[PDB]
Enzyme design. Structure first.
Site, PDB file in Angstrom:
ATOM      1  N   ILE F  85       0.791  -1.253   0.040  1.00  0.00           N
ATOM      2  CA  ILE F  85      -0.163   0.040   0.035  1.00  0.00           C
ATOM      3  C   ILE F  85       0.988   1.206   0.051  1.00  0.00           C
ATOM      4  CG2 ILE F  85      -0.214   0.089   2.290  1.00  0.00           C
ATOM      5  CD1 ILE F  85      -2.948   1.282  -0.141  1.00  0.00           C
ATOM      6  N   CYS F  86       0.268   2.454  -0.686  1.00  0.00           N
ATOM      7  CA  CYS F  86       1.102   3.604  -0.641  1.00  0.00           C
ATOM      8  C   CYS F  86       0.410   4.534   0.058  1.00  0.00           C
ATOM      9  CB  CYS F  86       1.379   3.954  -2.295  1.00  0.00           C
ATOM     10  SG  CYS F  86      -0.061   3.901  -3.253  1.00  0.00           S
ATOM     11  N   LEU F  87       0.808   4.952   1.309  1.00  0.00           N
ATOM     12  CA  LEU F  87      -0.112   5.878   2.064  1.00  0.00           C
ATOM     13  C   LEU F  87       1.247   6.736   2.764  1.00  0.00           C
ATOM     14  CD1 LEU F  87      -2.637   4.727   4.727  1.00  0.00           C
ATOM     15  CD2 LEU F  87      -0.692   6.141   5.328  1.00  0.00           C
ATOM     16  N   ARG F  91       4.923   6.243   5.190  1.00  0.00           N
ATOM     17  CA  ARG F  91       6.252   6.321   4.672  1.00  0.00           C
ATOM     18  C   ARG F  91       7.132   7.471   5.497  1.00  0.00           C
ATOM     19  NH1 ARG F  91       3.336   5.900   0.388  1.00  0.00           N
ATOM     20  NH2 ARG F  91       1.982   7.546  -0.309  1.00  0.00           N
TER      21      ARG F  91
END
Ligand SMILES: [Zn+2]
Ligand SMILES: [Zn+2]
Lengths: 88, 110, 99, 83, 93, 148, 99, 82, 109, 95
Positions: F85-87, F91
């Site tokens: 997932i890209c959140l 990050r």
DNA sequence: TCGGATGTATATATCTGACACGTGCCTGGAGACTAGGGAGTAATCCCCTTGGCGGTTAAAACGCGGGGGACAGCGCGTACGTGCGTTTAAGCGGTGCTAGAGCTGTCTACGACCAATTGAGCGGCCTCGGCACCGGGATTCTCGAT
DNA sequence: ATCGAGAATCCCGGTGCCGAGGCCGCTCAATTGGTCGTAGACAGCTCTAGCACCGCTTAAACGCACGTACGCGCTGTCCCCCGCGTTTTAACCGCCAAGGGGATTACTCCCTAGTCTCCAGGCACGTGTCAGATATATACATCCGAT
């Protein structure tokens, strides 16, 4: 008066405010939590997301980071918690 | 970071990393430019710019203006203890000076 | 009747008024003429970009302001409040400009 | 188009203003001349370098970057006009 | 015409990141451009002199780190070193 | 030394307060390896579906973010092949004061509307922002044949 | 009978004798110890090349001699012949070291 | 470990350094002050010297390190390398 | 002057021109180094060295010593004007300092 | 093993000396000082010519770059004489 | 202490041009692939750095008497600040001309690159003279005493 | 003013030692020759910005009067640096010993330059609108003479 042992904890690691620090945003967290949230995070407040970089520099330059008077209240009101926290 | 997006994003920064890489290559600083150096340098640049812009914004809020102007930059740089030492020789254009009068010149309390 | 401030107050008021601002103090055209004169002395038949004249003016003003700060420090050091030419000469000799 | 005694364009009130901004409360009548001298010297160490850049690039206009480079060479880095 | 490069958009991004309401004048943007270019020149030049002193032939990260330890005064040095190490660690993985 | 107490607080939180339309727990005896189950929100093209996701708490939790990834195969603009997932708060925007519940609610909000700004899989993002009918068709088909 | 020079002559004689020579004035071993102390403060468990200690001593002596030249200039400027700490502080403040 | 070694910069050594500078008469409050400023100078050069030594992954501070530190500060030194 | 000989002698210098060429190439000063730049640079360096050695040899002859030492280099650099303006910040190791007693400190009747 | 070689301007400074003062020697510390001086001046001039060729987007350090760096870097009479010597040497080399 | 008098900060309409934002595109940044040499790791080796006596003795530490300079106090006579009426030229706007900065296209002579090859320069050895040093002698400032 | 005793400094000659200058052998980098891609010189075109001029407003420079604060000189005090003799601490030197880590050599591999293809990040450009400058009219603070 003083808030109970519940609120006397650090709002991050749920542990006692051992050597607390009072940020310009009025928040507070224990010195290890502070040094972590500054040396491994974005120099911002963990509570309201407020950068304290310049303030951090200005106060560690004088070694005036720890809030002495709140810490004295903690050591006179809840000393045993600070001592059991002192080992680890 | 497996993300195959622009290296700026993959490093989390805002400053460009490809541009810094080029400037470090075409600039005759060294023969080889490692793949880690541009990221590091872009991060340092972004951090310093963030410091100065934060201080200047504070000063501009103090003077009740919502738009940083060189005077606020001069105030921010000269009032800090380290940014002044880093820019001791620099001269900000249209910057004025720090308002201070020598103590001996103030009038005699009579 | 003619209300006049004691000598030494308008000076401080002017100090505050001028430290609280940023605009240029040396008028534009005379400084431009001086710069062009020194130029034609160095290499004749020159032209100047207005930005270059402005940069010269900013540099000169900042330099003179720094020199007057250090001169005032000297004059105060000698138990005075007036700046005299020996103060400026001492400032420049210590600063390392002319030796 | 020659010119003469243009350094008298740096009048006495202008030097008094420069001294006020520097935080000087009382100025002696022999500063003005002295200051002019100093000022001239400073210019004859910047323009000489600025022109030297212009002569090199084979131009006839001293650009802002020329003056900024000439300044940076003397250790008086100037921000706001480029580079 | 010809197109010039500048750090204007990135400085504005950082501004809107640390002060979501205050804009920035044009002349202040020029001053920030000049400041970024100057610090770039300083850090890169010192890293190059390090590479040349140690007879290396490449500017790795650690050369930039030592240049930052040299140029910036104490506390700025520590903070910027930490920030750069963090950025590189995140970029690698 | 603080990670143990942090995960203790988090498990006590999920005990006393179940996340909104979600649940979680330690998949094994170890506290740093977790499994969670999310229900398909109404204002999301994945209505009714249930998805299991794996959580890996770091060594310097909370000051380091815990990597979460969907184990079930989802055809999402923010879910790649394996299910990462890209959140942003996973990050760099990760504030260590956050709990599990807040990151779970954030991933819920992302499930409500995919963010193809910095996507992982390009074609699903482009078909989501190009023609939404085929998009929610395929996502509903996925969340009925894999989430049910 | 005990012949003693007036106060102010042995000083000038020493000025001449020390300006006419070049050897080091700060004794070697105490300066070496001071340098090693500051070193162990910065990064512990260090070793030093004798040439590096000598270079440090040369730089320190030249710096102090320059500072005393400018301090003496200040003290003369204030119509004195003795150097006092305010003289050194003024020299360093003007020179641009500490501000 | 070492302590109280700035007192190794004795009073007559500062008197000598003052004579060579051309100072005829010294006031008893200079000595202390002098030590002070000298220390600062050292704490500004050694710090950089070490920074070079720590970069090359060495443990001795060679003369070239001190020379580079000085040159970096603006006190170029001739006689040891460079 | 056409020749097939060491570039130094062909240029009429004493400093090496090949060594200066190599230093200009392998120093990352620029990408390409024109064939006429190292000659110019070697000539300038030779002129400056000759200047300082002239003055230092004079100053050494003054002290009846027939061999330059650092003290004489320092004297020859400080006494001159252009050289002292060029080496203003440089510190000559073991160089001493110019004899200079301020006038006010001198005795008086 | 064998010690690695270290280049220096010792013999060239000695040649220039024996040209100027045909009877005056020079001591090792003075030689080190002259060597470091040559190195420092070489670095100043070369770096200045480098910045100068980078300002005008050139990629070549011609002789003109060294000439202008000398004009920028030295005081009046030294600048004039050194530029004269350089031009003389370059034209003698090319002719 | 004290009420006029003046400069300063403050609140309010207004208006304009500098800044923030949307757009087309296009040039530079990103991605895949290959090669090679720069850097890292291992091993070794010997240069030189730390550590330690122990003797000599130059140099620091201490105390003392005093005299000369730091420093405070008075005074006084001028240089300079404040205010004002007057004269000068700076600043602004608008206009006209063109010199020269800047950009594109073409073409070649200059510099990089590479293989060979050979002498200048560097490391090592060494030896005689320049400088260091000591002892005595010549003289020259210095101080007190008239 | 002077002159004479007392230390201090400059000259001079004899002795000695170590290092500066020179010789020799040999490696390696400077030179030569050829090839080749392209940075740069040069012509040509464009059109941006600098220069010159003029007329009007009004702000700043200026010359002058005058009162006065202070810069400078003098006096007087006293205390604190200087010179010097005496004693005590420690630098310096010559010597020896251990070992560590700087420097060097050989090998290997993976990190970066170089190349090609492709496409969107950012840049020049155009456009709208509100932040700040301006003008006006107040309240307010501060200075100064006179009690
Ligand atoms: Zn805590
Ligand atoms: Zn906060």
């Amino acid at each position: 008066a003083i808030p109970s042992l519940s609120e006397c904890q650090c709002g991050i690691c749920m542990e006692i405010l051992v050597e607390p620090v009072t940020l310009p945003c009025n928040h507070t967290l224990c010195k290890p939590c502070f040094q972590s949230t500054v040396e491994k995070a974005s120099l911002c407040c963990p509570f309201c997301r407020r950068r304290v970089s310049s303030w951090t520099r200005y106060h560690t330059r004088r070694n005036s980071l720890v809030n002495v008077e709140l810490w004295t209240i903690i050591q006179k009101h809840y000393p045993r918690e600070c001592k059991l926290r002192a080992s680890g | 970071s497996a993300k195959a997006k622009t290296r700026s994003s993959r490093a989390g920064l805002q400053f460009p990393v490809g541009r810094v890489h080029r400037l470090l290559r075409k600039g005759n600083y060294s023969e080889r430019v490692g793949a880690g150096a541009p990221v590091y340098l872009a991060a340092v640049l972004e951090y310093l710019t963030a410091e100065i812009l934060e201080l200047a914004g504070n000063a501009a809020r103090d003077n009740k203006k919502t738009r940083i102007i060189p005077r606020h930059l001069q105030l921010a740089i000269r009032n800090d203890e380290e940014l002044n030492k880093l820019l001791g020789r620099v001269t900000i254009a249209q910057g004025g000076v720090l308002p201070n009068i020598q103590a001996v010149l103030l009038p005699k309390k009579t | 009747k003619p209300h006049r401030y004691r000598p030494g107050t308008v000076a401080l008021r002017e100090i505050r008024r001028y430290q609280k601002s940023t605009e240029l103090l040396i008028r534009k055209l005379p400084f431009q003429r001086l710069v062009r004169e020194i130029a034609q002395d160095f290499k004749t038949d020159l032209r100047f970009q207005s930005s270059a004249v402005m940069a010269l003016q900013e540099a000169c003003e900042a330099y003179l302001v720094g020199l007057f700060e250090d001169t005032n420090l000297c004059a105060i050091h000698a138990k005075r409040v007036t700046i005299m030419p020996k103060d400026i000469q001492l400032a420049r000799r210590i600063r390392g400009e002319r030796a | 188009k020659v010119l003469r005694d243009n350094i008298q364009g740096i009048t006495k009130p202008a030097i008094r203003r420069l001294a006020r901004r520097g935080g000087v409360k009382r100025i002696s009548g022999l500063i003005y001349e002295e200051t002019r001298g100093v000022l001239k010297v400073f210019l004859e160490n910047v323009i000489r370098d600025a022109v030297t850049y212009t002569e090199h690039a084979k131009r006839k206009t001293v650009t802002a970057m020329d003056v900024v480079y000439a300044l940076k060479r003397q250790g008086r880095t100037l921000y706001g006009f480029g580079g | 015409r010809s197109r010039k490069e500048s750090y204007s958009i990135y400085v504005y991004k950082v501004l809107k990141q640390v002060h979501p309401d205050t804009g920035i004048s044009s002349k202040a943007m020029g001053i920030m451009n000049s400041f970024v270019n100057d610090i770039f020149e300083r850090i890169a030049g010192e890293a190059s002199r390090l590479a040349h002193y140690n007879k290396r032939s490449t500017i790795t990260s650690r050369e930039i780190q030592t240049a930052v330890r040299l140029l910036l005064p104490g506390e700025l040095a520590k903070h910027a070193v930490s920030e750069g190490t963090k950025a590189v660690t995140k970029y690698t993985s | 030394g603080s990670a143990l107490k942090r995960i203790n607080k988090e498990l006590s939180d999920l005990a006393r307060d179940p996340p909104a339309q979600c649940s979680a727990g330690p998949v094994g005896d170890d506290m740093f390896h977790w499994q969670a189950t999310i229900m398909g929100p109404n204002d999301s093209p994945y209505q009714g579906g249930v998805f299991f996701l794996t959580i890996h708490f770091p060594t310097d939790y909370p000051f380091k973010p815990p990597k979460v990834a969907f184990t079930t195969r989802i055809y999402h603009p923010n879910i790649n092949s394996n299910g990462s997932i890209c959140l942003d708060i996973l990050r760099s925007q990760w504030s260590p004061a956050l709990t599990i519940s807040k990151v779970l609610l954030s991933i819920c909000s992302l499930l409500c509307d995919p963010n193809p700004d910095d996507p992982l899989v390009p074609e699903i993002a482009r078909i989501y922002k190009t023609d939404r009918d085929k998009y929610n068709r395929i996502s509903r088909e996925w969340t009925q044949k894999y989430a049910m």
